[PDB]
Amino acid sequence: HMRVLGLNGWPRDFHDASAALLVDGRIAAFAEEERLTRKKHGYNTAPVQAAAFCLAQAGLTVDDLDAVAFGWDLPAMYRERLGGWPHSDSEALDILLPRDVFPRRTDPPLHFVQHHLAHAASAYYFSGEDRGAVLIVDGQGEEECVTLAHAEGGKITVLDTVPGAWSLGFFYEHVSEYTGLGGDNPGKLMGLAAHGTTVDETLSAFAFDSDGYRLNLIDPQARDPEDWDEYSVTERAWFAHLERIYRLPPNEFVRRYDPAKGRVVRDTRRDPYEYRDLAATAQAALERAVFGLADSVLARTGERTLFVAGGVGLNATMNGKLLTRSTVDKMFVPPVASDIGVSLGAAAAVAVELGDRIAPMGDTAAWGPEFSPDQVRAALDRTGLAYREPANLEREVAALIASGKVVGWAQGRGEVGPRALGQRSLLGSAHSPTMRDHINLRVKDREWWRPFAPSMLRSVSDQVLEVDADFPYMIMTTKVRAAYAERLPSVVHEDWSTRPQTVTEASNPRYHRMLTELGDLVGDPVCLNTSFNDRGEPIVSSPADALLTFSRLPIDALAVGPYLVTKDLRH
Ligand SMILES: [Fe+2]
Ligand SMILES: [K+]
Ligand SMILES: [K+]
């Protein structure tokens, strides 16, 4: 047995803390720190809770680990940007895996994996493809924002990189911040982009070419001498530039006491929807730049399978377009394309180096904690709420969804990555022309313009989608076929695009069974599946998380383990 615990997250200026445990090339456990701490983005912390979960899940201690792997070359970052790496491996381990939580007789071997290699490994080794072109499009690794590489024979070989100051990831975040959506919410910008019109996709900054892009706006070697990434420098250049060329200045954040909430709340001075043309233009710029990069690495490596990772790899809209490009035959993008994935990627790189073969992710991201009926019942008993244990939970949930009710669904192992995939989901009718507004406005109290996406049986996706492939992660858009382009108004855009999850019976028997039951009711084993949370918290993880969220949102029912809780509608 090779047992490799991969980590991301550090107490200093870090985000997306996570931990992943590989046992014999298989993912035994994987969690994001935020889901456990309830603090979004897992900022400024070693993945203490995630790693503790991984070990508990696998019945291991640190002494059982062959290696600890970290998904950045942190010593290099310290030496380059901070004047030196002051920690011995043991001191680094004490910080990554504090001894009060992680008792140990001795130190496991500690590996620092170069950040983009970790990203790349998170795609390649888990894709189930033996070779392909690697495109890493990121905020920034230690120094580069882009890496082009060749994956083959179990090896990843870098062909080229692009320096941090030219980051497409930072660019997009800066635009997202500029619009008031926030640099921490690039996914919103992508959603907003669909509502805008693109004027000039260069934004008077990019020049596009067949291999990617240039950004003459910024010295490619520019560097923040007072930090260890170029975010601040790129932020300043982009904000100054955008204000010059775009009709609207930055959308400012407003902090005011709201007597209705009894607290100071953060709002935006302007409606971000006003910036929709900026959003559309940014999205078009990003796509175009990335098309060039992808074409380039595919041509250079002579592959037709594309692996994408890095934070920009979460741009599902861009991914769908990459997928239809004449230069691409197959694509794999892991659900953890962002920095949360570099724990797993670092683990894989190390495990591979130690001679293990890495198994394919296989159409599931359900690697987080799960809870037994007794554990769920314990959380239920805390609330004093009445509940039922349906003889056929999946059937009853199907009928609730069919009738236009919104159902919390907390089952099995929590998914990893930012998408709910039927382990921690809010479910609703894909067929309802009012469900979208209901969930945006009534349920999650958020922006009317946010899109929703469908889960569907893999066994019907051939008929529903124009492409007969697995879409296990909702990380890639595609188009529905004519026969379904009007049946599914809550989850299919005007232009027939959608960002689906396909579900196999093996990946998730209960969800699969539920979708099946729903199919007998509404014709199509397809439902709306959105994240189980709202805007203020990470996706719920524990049964207590689910009950808490259930109780503060006008959700109709909660299916948590074998139990069904419905809204206390008695007066
Ligand atoms: Fe990254
Ligand atoms: K294609
Ligand atoms: K009730």
XYZ file of C-alpha atoms and ligand atoms in Angstrom:
574
model
C 0.000 0.000 0.000
C 1.190 3.462 -0.924
C -0.600 6.025 1.232
C -0.066 9.618 0.251
C -1.757 12.563 1.914
C -1.828 15.613 -0.344
C -2.346 19.083 1.105
C -3.092 22.623 0.048
C -3.396 25.592 2.381
C -0.929 27.481 4.564
C -1.519 30.010 7.339
C -0.054 32.891 5.302
C -1.901 34.524 2.393
C -3.393 31.291 1.025
C -6.790 30.166 -0.155
C -8.543 26.892 -1.058
C -7.115 24.748 1.710
C -7.942 21.091 1.092
C -6.613 17.625 1.749
C -6.703 14.433 -0.301
C -5.689 10.928 0.683
C -4.588 8.403 -1.937
C -4.427 4.753 -0.997
C -2.977 2.499 -3.699
C -3.706 5.143 -6.327
C -7.311 5.397 -5.224
C -8.946 8.367 -3.555
C -9.780 7.204 -0.051
C -10.868 10.681 1.062
C -10.840 14.281 -0.115
C -12.344 17.395 1.474
C -12.177 21.167 1.243
C -11.396 22.929 4.491
C -14.252 25.411 3.997
C -16.916 22.680 4.079
C -15.743 21.611 7.515
C -14.905 25.015 8.998
C -17.960 26.653 7.394
C -15.594 29.440 6.335
C -15.757 30.019 2.576
C -12.600 29.644 0.495
C -10.485 28.031 3.211
C -8.315 31.132 3.604
C -5.063 31.432 5.511
C -4.999 28.011 7.063
C -3.405 24.625 6.805
C -6.130 22.107 5.859
C -6.315 20.929 9.483
C -9.926 19.748 9.440
C -9.776 18.279 5.925
C -6.634 16.307 6.682
C -8.065 15.127 10.000
C -11.135 13.938 8.162
C -9.063 12.155 5.517
C -7.165 10.203 8.180
C -10.286 9.394 10.205
C -12.052 8.249 7.039
C -9.220 5.869 6.141
C -8.592 4.711 9.695
C -5.022 6.015 9.512
C -2.638 8.215 11.473
C 0.279 10.222 10.087
C 2.535 7.255 10.974
C 0.676 5.235 8.328
C 1.477 7.692 5.565
C 4.221 7.000 3.058
C 4.379 10.677 2.173
C 2.889 14.090 2.778
C 2.667 16.174 -0.386
C 1.996 19.910 -0.684
C 0.689 21.357 -3.959
C 3.030 24.331 -4.194
C 6.808 24.686 -4.197
C 6.539 26.676 -0.983
C 10.277 26.743 -0.194
C 10.894 28.259 -3.625
C 8.199 30.857 -2.991
C 9.776 31.777 0.340
C 13.290 31.959 -1.095
C 12.229 34.005 -4.085
C 9.721 36.377 -2.546
C 10.355 36.415 1.203
C 14.134 36.238 1.438
C 14.321 32.605 2.494
C 12.667 29.361 3.571
C 13.139 29.156 7.344
C 11.463 25.793 8.073
C 12.961 22.355 8.392
C 10.679 19.630 7.039
C 9.700 18.885 10.621
C 8.795 22.511 11.316
C 6.825 22.664 8.070
C 5.006 19.482 9.059
C 4.226 20.956 12.492
C 2.495 23.814 10.655
C 0.763 21.702 7.991
C -0.311 18.997 10.416
C -0.277 20.448 13.941
C 0.703 17.843 16.498
C -2.274 18.568 18.733
C -4.467 17.251 15.905
C -1.964 14.946 14.209
C 0.076 12.993 16.741
C 3.124 11.255 15.189
C 6.112 9.117 16.288
C 8.221 10.312 13.361
C 8.094 12.574 10.293
C 6.625 11.216 7.079
C 8.618 12.237 3.987
C 7.525 15.748 2.958
C 7.275 16.657 -0.738
C 6.610 20.076 -2.209
C 5.091 19.701 -5.648
C 5.415 22.606 -8.076
C 1.986 24.191 -8.255
C 1.187 23.752 -11.935
C 2.520 20.192 -11.894
C 0.026 19.562 -9.105
C -2.746 21.134 -11.186
C -1.667 19.046 -14.187
C -1.479 15.841 -12.160
C -5.007 16.488 -10.845
C -6.254 16.355 -14.435
C -3.999 13.850 -16.191
C -3.691 11.029 -13.679
C -7.399 10.947 -12.967
C -8.699 11.350 -16.522
C -8.563 7.685 -17.491
C -6.663 8.737 -20.616
C -3.080 7.605 -21.022
C -1.973 10.705 -22.931
C -2.949 14.227 -23.814
C -2.094 17.877 -24.070
C -2.032 19.704 -20.721
C -3.281 23.286 -20.429
C -2.991 24.888 -16.992
C -4.732 28.265 -16.874
C -4.500 29.691 -13.410
C -4.438 32.777 -11.267
C -0.743 32.157 -10.555
C 1.507 29.295 -9.508
C 4.851 30.242 -7.966
C 5.730 32.375 -11.001
C 3.623 31.433 -14.017
C -0.065 31.913 -14.806
C -0.122 29.425 -17.665
C 1.589 26.110 -18.228
C 1.532 24.100 -21.439
C 2.663 20.530 -21.075
C 2.635 17.085 -22.629
C 1.159 14.204 -20.667
C 2.230 10.746 -21.782
C 3.557 7.481 -20.419
C 2.642 8.653 -16.936
C 4.918 11.690 -17.288
C 4.161 15.396 -17.461
C 6.653 17.458 -19.441
C 6.413 21.253 -19.517
C 6.686 22.846 -22.954
C 6.089 26.487 -22.007
C 4.795 28.885 -19.354
C 3.409 32.440 -19.244
C 4.565 34.819 -16.487
C 2.224 35.804 -13.657
C 1.640 39.411 -14.684
C -0.182 38.157 -17.776
C -2.616 36.071 -15.746
C -5.924 35.355 -17.413
C -7.180 34.221 -14.016
C -6.283 37.500 -12.302
C -7.641 39.464 -15.273
C -11.023 37.777 -14.936
C -11.067 38.162 -11.152
C -10.175 41.829 -11.471
C -13.063 42.307 -13.916
C -15.321 40.405 -11.578
C -14.251 42.725 -8.735
C -14.635 45.812 -10.958
C -18.280 44.940 -11.658
C -18.978 44.555 -7.941
C -19.487 40.810 -8.271
C -16.168 40.402 -6.482
C -12.820 38.865 -7.364
C -13.697 35.966 -5.070
C -16.760 35.218 -7.284
C -15.525 34.794 -10.872
C -18.290 32.211 -11.404
C -20.813 35.058 -11.106
C -19.071 37.061 -13.808
C -19.352 34.029 -16.100
C -23.059 33.899 -15.321
C -23.430 37.623 -15.968
C -21.500 37.360 -19.246
C -24.345 35.404 -20.836
C -26.584 38.482 -20.525
C -24.253 40.974 -22.136
C -23.098 41.818 -25.623
C -19.451 41.814 -26.679
C -18.217 44.969 -28.312
C -14.456 44.684 -28.698
C -13.095 41.414 -27.313
C -9.549 42.786 -27.097
C -10.691 45.225 -24.407
C -7.969 47.407 -25.972
C -5.494 45.281 -23.982
C -5.265 41.811 -25.481
C -3.842 40.969 -28.859
C -4.889 37.483 -29.872
C -2.901 35.039 -31.941
C -3.015 31.428 -33.042
C -0.988 30.273 -30.000
C -2.792 32.342 -27.380
C -2.537 36.019 -26.518
C -0.457 39.014 -25.665
C -1.129 41.626 -23.040
C 0.777 44.744 -24.051
C -1.011 46.611 -21.271
C 1.337 44.949 -18.789
C 5.036 44.282 -18.642
C 5.047 40.456 -18.581
C 7.939 40.513 -16.119
C 6.248 42.962 -13.758
C 6.341 41.731 -10.166
C 5.119 42.816 -6.759
C 8.386 43.106 -4.779
C 6.152 43.371 -1.693
C 4.234 40.124 -2.157
C 4.636 36.662 -3.640
C 2.174 36.925 -6.468
C 1.390 39.599 -9.049
C -2.265 40.046 -8.023
C -1.855 43.589 -6.693
C 0.184 44.736 -9.671
C -2.243 43.237 -12.160
C -5.167 44.574 -10.149
C -3.878 48.137 -10.403
C -3.138 47.919 -14.130
C -6.502 46.337 -14.936
C -8.508 48.723 -12.779
C -6.794 51.774 -14.266
C -7.181 50.427 -17.790
C -10.821 49.383 -17.390
C -11.742 52.754 -15.997
C -10.155 54.416 -19.022
C -11.880 52.322 -21.698
C -15.213 51.285 -20.164
C -18.139 53.675 -19.773
C -18.608 52.766 -16.089
C -16.041 53.239 -13.323
C -15.417 50.537 -10.701
C -18.551 49.427 -8.862
C -17.848 50.270 -5.238
C -18.744 48.236 -2.212
C -20.969 49.868 0.377
C -20.978 48.943 4.051
C -24.068 50.140 5.873
C -26.003 49.233 8.955
C -29.210 47.559 7.854
C -31.868 47.924 10.569
C -33.793 45.008 9.064
C -30.818 42.692 9.646
C -29.444 44.420 12.730
C -25.943 44.472 11.295
C -23.599 46.212 8.910
C -24.088 44.532 5.534
C -22.024 44.818 2.358
C -23.802 45.885 -0.827
C -22.688 47.424 -4.140
C -23.160 51.054 -5.109
C -24.354 49.980 -8.544
C -26.249 46.932 -9.803
C -23.586 44.605 -11.256
C -26.056 43.785 -14.046
C -25.216 47.233 -15.479
C -21.745 45.871 -16.318
C -23.137 42.941 -18.337
C -21.417 44.125 -21.535
C -18.099 44.308 -19.658
C -18.773 40.785 -18.377
C -19.618 39.477 -21.853
C -16.515 41.143 -23.293
C -14.258 39.764 -20.551
C -15.650 36.287 -21.127
C -15.081 36.558 -24.883
C -11.522 37.773 -24.289
C -10.828 34.884 -21.920
C -12.273 32.329 -24.328
C -10.289 33.640 -27.264
C -7.016 33.688 -25.351
C -7.638 30.178 -24.081
C -8.648 28.847 -27.528
C -5.218 29.908 -28.792
C -3.422 28.326 -25.856
C -5.353 25.079 -26.284
C -4.842 24.924 -30.062
C -1.175 25.603 -29.431
C -0.483 22.845 -26.901
C -2.576 20.368 -28.906
C -0.603 21.141 -32.074
C 2.797 21.046 -30.333
C 2.160 17.736 -28.539
C 0.246 16.218 -31.439
C -2.521 15.068 -29.130
C -6.288 15.461 -29.529
C -7.114 14.902 -25.866
C -7.013 18.082 -23.801
C -6.510 18.194 -20.043
C -7.390 21.503 -18.394
C -6.820 22.594 -14.825
C -6.034 25.753 -12.919
C -8.718 28.104 -11.638
C -9.768 29.220 -15.117
C -10.619 25.576 -15.767
C -13.803 26.237 -13.804
C -15.095 28.376 -16.648
C -17.684 25.890 -17.898
C -18.787 28.192 -20.714
C -15.245 28.346 -22.067
C -14.844 24.604 -21.591
C -17.933 23.823 -23.659
C -16.533 25.886 -26.510
C -13.119 24.250 -26.195
C -14.907 20.934 -26.474
C -16.508 21.772 -29.823
C -13.253 23.091 -31.310
C -12.081 21.225 -34.399
C -8.708 20.713 -32.664
C -10.098 18.784 -29.672
C -11.559 15.266 -29.651
C -11.683 14.473 -25.957
C -11.474 16.658 -22.891
C -11.047 15.986 -19.240
C -11.355 18.669 -16.603
C -11.365 17.460 -13.002
C -14.079 18.843 -10.676
C -11.212 20.228 -8.633
C -9.566 22.193 -11.454
C -9.026 25.103 -9.077
C -6.478 25.250 -6.276
C -8.484 22.881 -4.111
C -7.298 20.237 -6.572
C -3.590 20.708 -5.946
C -3.739 18.714 -2.714
C -4.967 15.749 -4.759
C -2.612 16.580 -7.631
C 0.404 16.767 -5.313
C -0.617 13.427 -3.788
C -0.871 11.868 -7.244
C 2.459 13.208 -8.473
C 4.129 11.793 -5.403
C 2.243 8.476 -5.481
C 3.166 8.064 -9.135
C 6.792 8.822 -8.332
C 6.580 6.112 -5.636
C 5.423 3.655 -8.273
C 1.659 3.654 -7.831
C -0.858 3.656 -10.673
C -3.593 6.259 -10.266
C -7.194 5.142 -10.785
C -9.631 7.276 -12.809
C -11.992 9.547 -10.864
C -14.769 7.686 -12.590
C -17.789 9.961 -12.856
C -17.995 10.931 -9.185
C -16.632 13.631 -6.898
C -18.203 12.179 -3.767
C -15.161 11.879 -1.516
C -16.099 13.955 1.494
C -17.595 12.859 4.794
C -20.817 10.909 4.907
C -22.998 10.135 7.863
C -24.853 7.037 8.998
C -28.588 6.983 9.794
C -27.796 7.050 13.508
C -25.606 10.114 13.014
C -28.276 11.887 10.969
C -30.907 10.947 13.535
C -28.703 12.437 16.245
C -28.607 15.750 14.391
C -32.349 15.516 13.789
C -33.071 14.820 17.452
C -31.169 18.011 18.366
C -33.658 20.109 16.424
C -36.784 18.602 17.956
C -38.301 18.602 14.442
C -40.709 15.841 13.461
C -39.569 13.736 10.540
C -40.378 10.592 8.588
C -38.423 7.640 7.285
C -40.142 6.907 3.958
C -40.386 3.337 2.753
C -39.340 4.737 -0.627
C -37.458 8.015 -0.153
C -36.370 8.267 -3.787
C -39.927 7.926 -5.076
C -41.282 10.464 -2.606
C -38.524 12.959 -3.434
C -39.278 12.462 -7.134
C -42.952 13.314 -6.561
C -42.038 16.417 -4.534
C -39.791 17.677 -7.319
C -42.396 16.810 -9.954
C -44.980 18.949 -8.130
C -42.666 21.973 -8.196
C -41.307 21.723 -4.672
C -37.706 22.442 -3.733
C -35.943 19.612 -1.931
C -32.720 19.619 0.050
C -30.822 16.427 -0.697
C -28.002 15.463 1.644
C -26.894 11.922 0.926
C -23.691 9.887 1.045
C -20.199 11.376 0.778
C -20.007 15.121 0.276
C -18.907 16.134 -3.182
C -15.587 17.931 -3.646
C -15.291 21.046 -5.794
C -17.730 23.964 -6.094
C -20.570 22.012 -7.779
C -23.301 20.087 -6.022
C -23.634 16.731 -7.778
C -26.408 14.964 -5.918
C -24.690 14.483 -2.546
C -25.356 18.004 -1.197
C -27.903 19.525 -3.546
C -31.029 21.595 -3.731
C -33.309 19.859 -6.231
C -36.167 21.330 -8.240
C -38.146 20.864 -11.441
C -36.112 21.139 -14.626
C -39.486 21.420 -16.418
C -40.934 24.427 -14.596
C -40.810 27.834 -16.320
C -41.029 29.502 -12.887
C -38.544 27.394 -10.883
C -35.542 29.546 -11.827
C -37.051 32.771 -10.468
C -38.425 30.872 -7.486
C -35.029 29.539 -6.457
C -33.060 32.694 -7.326
C -35.488 35.125 -5.744
C -37.570 33.262 -3.165
C -35.232 30.476 -2.031
C -31.661 31.828 -2.233
C -32.631 35.538 -2.293
C -30.026 36.380 -4.916
C -29.683 37.724 -8.485
C -32.479 37.019 -10.959
C -29.926 36.522 -13.735
C -28.165 33.494 -12.210
C -28.465 30.291 -14.316
C -29.369 26.792 -13.139
C -28.149 23.437 -14.359
C -29.572 19.907 -14.662
C -28.652 16.503 -13.365
C -29.798 13.703 -15.688
C -29.357 9.959 -16.107
C -26.332 9.168 -18.226
C -28.609 6.647 -19.947
C -30.715 9.428 -21.495
C -28.069 12.099 -22.024
C -27.498 10.767 -25.529
C -31.038 11.842 -26.430
C -31.018 15.008 -24.299
C -27.580 16.368 -25.241
C -26.065 16.794 -28.691
C -22.957 15.007 -27.392
C -22.977 11.423 -26.139
C -20.316 11.775 -23.456
C -20.036 11.704 -19.709
C -20.515 15.093 -18.041
C -20.080 14.012 -14.418
C -19.016 17.347 -12.922
C -21.075 20.221 -14.318
C -17.787 21.728 -15.420
C -18.591 21.857 -19.128
C -21.450 23.371 -21.099
C -22.936 21.657 -24.132
C -26.179 21.985 -26.101
C -29.420 20.023 -25.696
C -31.130 18.442 -28.713
C -34.189 20.014 -30.332
C -36.606 17.615 -28.658
C -35.497 18.917 -25.234
C -34.684 22.558 -25.951
C -38.073 23.719 -24.631
C -39.063 20.925 -22.238
C -36.457 22.014 -19.679
C -36.878 25.787 -19.236
C -35.325 26.086 -15.745
C -32.024 24.472 -16.735
C -31.589 25.179 -20.477
C -30.704 28.650 -21.791
C -32.388 30.366 -24.737
C -29.536 29.311 -27.012
C -30.052 25.654 -25.979
C -26.843 25.571 -23.927
C -26.764 23.792 -20.567
C -24.173 22.779 -17.963
C -25.206 19.244 -17.062
C -24.356 16.488 -14.696
C -24.839 13.016 -16.109
C -25.492 10.377 -13.488
C -24.631 6.689 -13.706
C -26.170 4.146 -11.360
C -22.707 3.192 -10.118
C -21.699 6.772 -9.257
C -24.799 7.393 -7.129
C -27.484 4.660 -6.820
C -29.911 6.719 -4.708
C -29.728 9.848 -6.854
C -29.913 7.608 -9.914
C -32.964 5.835 -8.517
C -34.555 9.201 -7.677
C -33.973 10.534 -11.189
C -35.471 7.310 -12.560
C -38.622 7.757 -10.461
C -38.831 11.364 -11.574
C -38.647 10.223 -15.196
C -41.805 8.138 -14.831
C -43.520 11.280 -13.572
C -42.412 14.039 -15.919
C -41.186 12.094 -18.938
C -37.532 12.964 -18.393
C -35.192 11.668 -15.685
C -33.827 15.204 -15.387
C -33.979 17.688 -12.544
C -32.606 21.076 -11.585
C -29.684 20.593 -9.204
C -28.160 23.624 -7.522
C -25.754 23.972 -4.580
C -27.234 23.245 -1.145
C -26.421 26.538 0.601
C -26.963 30.151 -0.144
C -24.548 32.975 -0.939
C -23.235 33.299 2.626
C -21.850 29.813 3.375
C -20.039 26.909 1.697
C -22.104 23.945 0.494
C -23.521 22.143 3.538
C -21.475 19.144 4.692
C -22.916 17.683 7.909
C -26.519 16.788 8.724
C -26.530 19.691 11.196
C -25.347 22.028 8.368
C -28.180 20.808 6.179
C -30.785 21.238 8.908
C -29.530 24.760 9.679
C -29.740 25.848 6.049
C -33.017 23.998 5.588
C -34.459 25.902 8.512
C -33.457 29.391 7.355
C -34.529 29.036 3.693
C -38.049 28.554 2.342
C -37.202 25.040 1.121
C -40.109 22.581 1.114
C -38.395 19.366 2.204
C -35.081 17.935 3.330
C -34.059 14.411 2.428
C -31.134 13.706 4.715
C -29.991 10.120 4.832
C -33.086 7.891 4.955
C -35.101 10.642 6.628
C -37.521 13.161 5.165
C -38.236 16.465 6.910
C -40.893 18.806 5.492
C -41.559 22.442 6.318
C -43.465 22.907 9.565
C -46.548 24.343 7.881
C -48.843 23.915 10.908
C -49.616 27.290 12.548
Fe -3.486 27.331 -9.065
K -14.608 18.670 -31.308
K -43.413 19.052 9.227
